Predict the structure.
Amino acid sequence: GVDIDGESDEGVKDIREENIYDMLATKKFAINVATEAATTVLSIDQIIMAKK
Amino acid sequence: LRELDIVHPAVKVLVMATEQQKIDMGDGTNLVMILAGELLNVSEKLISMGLSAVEIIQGYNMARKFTLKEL
Amino acid sequence: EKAKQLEGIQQWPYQAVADAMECIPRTLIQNAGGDPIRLLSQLRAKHAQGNFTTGIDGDKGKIVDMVSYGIWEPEVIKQQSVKTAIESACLLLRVDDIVSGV
Amino acid sequence: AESLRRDAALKVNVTSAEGLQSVLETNLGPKGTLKMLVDGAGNIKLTKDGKVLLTEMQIQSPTAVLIARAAAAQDEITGDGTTTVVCLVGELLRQAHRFIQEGVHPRIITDGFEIARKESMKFLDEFKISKTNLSNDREFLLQVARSSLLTKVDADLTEVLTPIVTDAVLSVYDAQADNLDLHMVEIMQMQHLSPKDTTFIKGLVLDHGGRHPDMPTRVKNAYVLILNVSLEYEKTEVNSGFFYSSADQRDKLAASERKFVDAKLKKIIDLKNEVCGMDPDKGFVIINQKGIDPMSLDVFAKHNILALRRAKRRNMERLQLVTGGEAQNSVEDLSPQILGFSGLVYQETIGEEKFTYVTENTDPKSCTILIKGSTHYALAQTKDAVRDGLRAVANVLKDKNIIPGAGAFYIALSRYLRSANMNKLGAKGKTKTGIEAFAEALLVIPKTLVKNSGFDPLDVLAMVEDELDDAQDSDETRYVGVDLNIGDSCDPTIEGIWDSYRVLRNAITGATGIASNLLLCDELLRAGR
């Protein structure tokens, strides 16, 4: 994976040492929400506003 | 995001999508907002290149189904 | 395809060079009236299947073969176009400051 | 004292129309763009409906005022084509404004439209296709339902709402002459679950259900009985309470509150012993519009009787049609024939609210469309797509005629009207100049659909004309239409893109009178102050 280092290291390290894992329910749900979020912004070519 | 004043209404779309992550799963709110902001940056080159935003949306729908099967 | 097997820091600018090589035929597409988005993606896909000699016609404006229809160019022009453009592009990036004086 | 005249209006009216045209130009079609409109309410709403766009924005320009009234008349009659008419009025002014510098008088421009409108009705009757009233058309209704859905969504939700919208009209509407009522179809809005998980509700759902931990999760073949009496303790009109200082005074004071409760409750539990006592796989459900006391919560748990409280008055009137049981005001007069019939009844478990499913009925004669969404704007967009889909299918059962979409009607009509007047030459020599402007104004719709997708509008136009030329030589009938996905032409009968006859019939006549009145104003009149 990606290592933050902070002391020293050469290259990267294995994630299985620290056992840092992400649940499938969290990762799979975050992709569909982020996809629909960017879909809404790209679909809007015009914005109408009014002063309060 | 609840303690910040939002001016542009387009930002509220990402704020409403951020609350979707906190209410149901409660984890990964940073993964939703940061990834959604990068999808607009990589699309900025496609919108400028002349690729219509319609096929850009259609491309993400086909790429989303390919990602869910690999998970 | 070759840049993916190197796996180094130089891999990223190779994609910028490959995109720059595609702008020369794409510029002719913009002058031919055809869609620069559609004709560029369809032409690039034909190189992975067909030969590398399939170019773009100025008279027609659709993807056609250069050899069968009698369109040819010498290699020396291609050798002098790539070498002199890269050598000149490097010299422009070597100057980080503009000195004013006699 | 000079006779010099001015324009000062038509040039501004067309310019103001071109500005409003470009707003709804990219909003038309399934490949169009979805725009966000928020005025003063802080409520994000995204919809492509042309009528909703004009009602949510205050436009000072007088040109858009008449266009706003045109969308209101099409919704109250046709119920669709709000954006298409706006695109036809704006483009027609562009072709007519070019002839103004030539000297063409606007009256002949308006008179040339009425001649082309009457000639369009002749081609309209030959081009339309009659559809049978038979109930085997559900397969054909799937293609018609997708035409309205693909426009207002991203096309991923269409496959989910395809069986829901199709089965919504066919279930509530029996097949006869009769008529159809869209008000009988309930609409429920929930912001909890995602829109991808939405489902169709055959019965009726209610808001406030009974809350007890021992209530059964699923009850199959349950009897529905309307109960108008109060099962909860009542107090005097003036605030008062019963306070007992001893155990003997407990049953004395509390008996006054449960006197009316025990009289009705003891008669209800006797019905369970006489009716549905032995019979397995059956149930008994009490409506009880009023509240429930904590005393009856333990009685209903031992008998597994589903309890309900705080019921909507309007929903109970429709329960008599779905279930069949009449409202019982007094248990003393209750008869065994009052008990209705219902199917599997199971309540979803959610902390904020709870649902009740009366669904799976023999003759429900009603439907409920449950709208789900994660955000607020997702609920407003989905509600707009459902209401537009029901009104589009509504004209399919009423009117037996159907027309193909995807520009198949506009390209064929624009080409027919151009070659009809040249052969006949029965109108006028000067009038055909303005008639050509009407024929060229009908080709903007197929050019608009390909414009949002990035395709060349001139390329797709020449490909359709090449296919129509081969169809004129042969004596057969072949329809040609624009395919947005591939980019070439397509057969609209195979693709399944169809548009209502009533919507397109009032679209040509409606856009004719609206665009004509804008050309009749020579000078803007400012007065009243």
In short: Chain B touches chain C through four residues (CB under 8 Å). Helices of chain B lie at 9-23, 29-49, 53-70.
